[PDB]
Amino acid sequence: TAQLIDGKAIAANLRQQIAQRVTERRQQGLRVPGLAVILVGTDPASQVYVAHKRKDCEEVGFLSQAYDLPAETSQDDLLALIDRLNDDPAIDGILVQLPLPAHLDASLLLERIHPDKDVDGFHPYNIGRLAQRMPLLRPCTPKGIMTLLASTGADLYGMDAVVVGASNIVGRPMALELLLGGCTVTVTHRFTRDLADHVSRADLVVVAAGKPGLVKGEWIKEGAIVIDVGINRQADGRLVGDVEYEVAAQRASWITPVPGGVGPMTRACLLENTLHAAEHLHD
Amino acid sequence: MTAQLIDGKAIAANLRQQIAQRVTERRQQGLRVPGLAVILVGTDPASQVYVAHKRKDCEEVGFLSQAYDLPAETSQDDLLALIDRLNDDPAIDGILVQLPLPAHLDASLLLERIHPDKDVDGFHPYNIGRLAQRMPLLRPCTPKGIMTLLASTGADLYGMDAVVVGASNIVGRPMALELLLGGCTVTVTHRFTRDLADHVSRADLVVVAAGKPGLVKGEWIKEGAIVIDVGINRQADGRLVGDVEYEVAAQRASWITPVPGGVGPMTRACLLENTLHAAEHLHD
């Protein structure tokens, strides 16, 4: 009964729009956006995810620079690579594939990225800027979920929204995006006393919990919008989502099927960030 | 009527002593005294008063003070260079800029020039982002102060339903990030919120920062709730009437802040606490 949000189709529309914009730039003599994607180590998951990023990068016609470093690359060498990419005016976005080898300080390395080239958008400065209602580059997964909400044509102003999975990296950012978008926002987490009462009052539910069946379909308010993205922002391979779909779908006005498009939306908004950076932040 | 009163002025005075006693300990032990550079640009009467308050407190706890009372016409570039020198001075732990600035300066670019490291006010986007991701560097001082007020009640914030009334306010978002880190379930409301009463009346903890007299009705307060009413002026509270209807709220709340209360002293006290922390933990 609920209409379906198709994140995969919206991510494709978004890649298509970015590719066309890039074609309008290149004919106009404007610089093509550059994206450096850095991989360190052997992790099969990370090789697959990085591969999807670069495939999406090529489709959209960005200038791209691959850096497939070996796992024992020093922290300092990696800093010098990030220092050099910041000072390269041909590069608009710098991506450091996660997770990184144990010896590497994850936070130090990621925070070395100029916030205006941090197209993932989770650099602390970027989240802080979102927090104070003037984002530089928005965290791409939350941004991607706002795009999902936008496709429903719903008016978020005054909507009671609930974010389930505060502990997740997307959770706080997601809350800041929804507040920016006009919603009253409740954030819940593992220690929330009565999740059912919070969810049942919500016009909008965003769940990123990685806990199958956590949100009962009975908790969903009639007419609610339900976004179920789990904890993997790069690829959704779940057979069952955090929300119990059947009943949820009987009551929601809009729902994301599971597995859904969180990965493609995340990559699309990542590219969208790279383009914006080029058009707006780098001259 | 029946609510234990949260006294922010007492707590702030108590906190200034501790900073003072710790400074005297460092001074007795030959360790470096924390340094605070306080910048004032222009001559706005309220801004002069507020820096005065900051600098009285700064001298009370025995910090090294550097005062920059600059003229209102001071160039943005000249002010940048001032910030640059202060950033690299090992004697200076905290760099503070009194607001508002004259309108001709890009106040964001200047405030962001400060190393989050020396941002003792704590509202640098980096600092707010670090707080957002559960790994705070220097905590925004007004929200930190509200967390201290709450800690003094002895309450367990874990699984409490908290509501922050004032998203508009510069404190609102950081308040929410503080409350979440403290383990509350947190709802943030603002001018487009529907049924504000329903959100407030479900809350075990209400933090209001609206600058709107009587906005939150005392009848909306949950029985046994903790109620913090700090208005929208972080440096002073001169309201005759608060955001919460005090008389009725006091009959229902377990703890409540009187109004006019201690948001200002608490804010300055936590700013000073961040300077000490900077000195003891972030610098040499």
Author numbering:
A (entry chain A): 2 to 284
B (entry chain B): 1 to 284
What do the authors of the reporting publication say about this deposited model?
Inspection of folate metabolism in P. aeruginosa drew our attention to the bifunctional enzyme methylenetetrahydrofolate dehydrogenase - cyclohydrolase. The enzymes that synthesize, link and modify tetrahydrofolate (THF) maintain the cellular levels of important cofactors such as methenyl-, methylene-, formyl- and unsubstituted THF. The gene encoding this cytosolic enzyme, folD, has been shown by knock-out studies to be essential in the Gram-positive Bacillus subtilis, as well as the Gram-negative Escherichia coli, Francisella novicida, Acinetobacter baylyi, and in P. aeruginosa itself. The PaFolD subunit consists of 284 residues arranged as a two domain structure, each with an α/β fold, connected by two long helices.
